[model samples]
Target: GMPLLIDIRKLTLITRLIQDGAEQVADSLATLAGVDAAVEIKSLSFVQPEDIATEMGGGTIYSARVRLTEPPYGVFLMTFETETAAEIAELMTGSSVEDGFTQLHESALQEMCNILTSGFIDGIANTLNATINMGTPTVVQDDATEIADKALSHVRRDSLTIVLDSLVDIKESDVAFSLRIFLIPDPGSFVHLIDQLDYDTDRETHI
Candidate 1:
């Protein structure tokens, strides 16, 4: 019970709350690229902040950050392989990043993140019968200096843990988009959101 976020048995319920957002994000982002895709929340575990990045995958990392400026606040973060981003950017803007990230690439990518991040929190807000406001998302390529400050600042890297892990399946091209998402809500609000969700223990969540 030392700085732990909850009573320790509601992990499933926590996923239940956030999964609403993930499902929204998946479909929104997929269609934004004009592709058919399904997103699965691979894991909803409490992990150290420092350890989350190594699992964020290799290649040029495009990390997008969004801060919830309303109550039950948190940060939504995504680190994607640049390979997937370029492909999506091309599909949406019909422009590709030939060498590295450019204004074209960043704009395409940030709006993509906007669909993703915005779609996510709307489910959360709707579920809670409240409104959540967030500013535009910022994207960084292989940029590590600001991620901690902007994305993970809510949780101390050494001490706190939230949610992580996921994948995106694009049906048309059969491509691999390795995506890692992190949701770090305030400890109090984290527990609060879980409490607000309706979980019927008598029924099992069957696929």
Candidate 2:
């Protein structure tokens, strides 16, 4: 079955909004890392949770889950592979990690996710003229499949899930990290988002 209200055009708009938000995330990371950072959106699409799990290789990875509420209630998951997670932890702590991450490293990653999530949510909220709130992010080390399923549990099994895959590179670093951001909106919020898009457009036309 097709998603209730989101069409191709609305998906395009959603992609553009997320791209704009991703730029802000890059800027924030650059500042946090004290180096030039570039975030390139590799792909954005509506996909199945199982497909995403397969793409993630179902291996161990670090995931941060943030719950979004208000007009477009949803769940946001930002995942990073182990190597990338270590590099990010090093960048944030200004320390060299030869192996596993410490508690500090985990906390740093969670905070980064929090900031990035805020930027992403703010972009959508601004466009829809809605107030969006995010819950405190929780970070966990788990298999990619498990993380995807947990993050998307609130939504319908058949509901479309939006996946935003990006590359985060630091100018002075040899490693370019991959980040997967997932958004799973509740069925009601999904329909509301579509209606809000039309309402916003009509108001703009009259003004």
Candidate 3:
């Protein structure tokens, strides 16, 4: 039997959870990178698979993929512009922002992804009382649209994906870092997550 899809009406709660998780990710990155970084959620919307590339300007970008295994199985993809990646790489390695990322820079970036993604996942797990284990992190340099497509490949073809577009700024730097976080949950897992959310809401309402 086909698993039930996410309820559109409950998307508001899902978005809230995502935003809260993203905030935690921002704080963690700021502390680890030793920069006063601020994360602003530019947009949160349900988008078609084909529209992902368009949203990313169809250009070169840096992407990191992290798989979530456990109650709410899903893929979490983090995409950043090349300049943004370089700035973060610099912060991570205490080096100058360069024209291209070296192996060391890439490694630092992956570690950042591991820490950032874990923080986001932890927030969701705490909120839903679910267990989530993160898979190994993979970093790549590719076309933005291609990365988005890969992130959505695990889900049903007709399902609309949730995309969170955010801007991260360093208080003392001019580098413009744009981040797009993609969440593609398996059909059954998504339904289960929504059910948990409903339960949490009802419990809170009665308290």
Candidate 4:
């Protein structure tokens, strides 16, 4: 059977978990990238609740679609616009605004995506005790479909696709962001993850 579409509310607990995980991961990334370590989650929503696709690209490309509002002069501000920041701000919250430079625009956005995606994935994997292999992330301008197809081209066609509807509002000022998370997996991969969970449960049950 293919993986079923899971409600965003049902995954609220998971969302918070992903936020925490992102914080930790982003913090470390900030240290290495010489940037501020900040992460926040404004809101989460689901897309295509009725379509449960397969395990493509290891699993559906679980995207966090976050919004991040940074200080105007921080290291991330050089190239990041209010719109891009709004998109990432959906996943972060705090009082301190980060400082970025224009020279580091491309690098900063790449790092930001890495931190958000990695943090969210780490959180989910730890919670479910599953391992997911992620491809190198790319940045696209107003073309999510092209990005999605390019990312999933290597995966089989029978993969499960769980689209998440999301909304992100940056705190304090009017900065905000929004996007959908696509959770992809094939039917066989779904069974594999579930079976692993059942195995863990059985072990606890026996003890």
Q: Choose the strongest candidate by lDDT.
A: 3
Q: Where does candidate 4 stray beyond 4 Å?
A: 1-103, 165-177
Candidate 4, residue 152: Cα displacement in angstroms equals 3.0
lDDT of 1 at 26: 72
At residue 196, give the lDDT of candidate 1: 53
Models 1 onward score TM values of 0.76, 0.82, 0.83, 0.51
Model 2: per-residue lDDT, tens digit, 94-169? 8777766787887878777776677667766766677688878867778876876776666556655778887877
> What clash count goes with each model?
0, 0, 0, 43
The lDDT for every candidate, in the order shown, is: 0.66, 0.71, 0.72, 0.42
Query: Which has the better TM-score: candidate 3, or candidate 4?
Result: 3
Give per-residue lDDT, candidate 2, residue 58.
Answer: 56
Write the residue-wise lDDT of candidate 3 on 15-49 in tens digits.
Answer: 67877786776777766665566767634677765
Superposition TM-score, candidate 4 onto the true structure: 0.51
Write candidate 4's Cα lDDT for 1-207 as tens digits.
Answer: 534454334444434444555455555445543345344443333323223222112222323232211110001001123455533433343222345323244344456566645655565466566555555554543333434444454444555444433333333545443334455445355545545545565678788
Which regions of candidate 1 are displaced past 4 Å? 1-9, 30-33, 99-102, 143-146, 153-160, 198-207
Query: 1 or 4, which is superior by lDDT?
Result: 1
lDDT by residue (tens digit), candidate 1, 113-192:
77767777886787667788885676677744445455666553454456566666666666555567777655566566
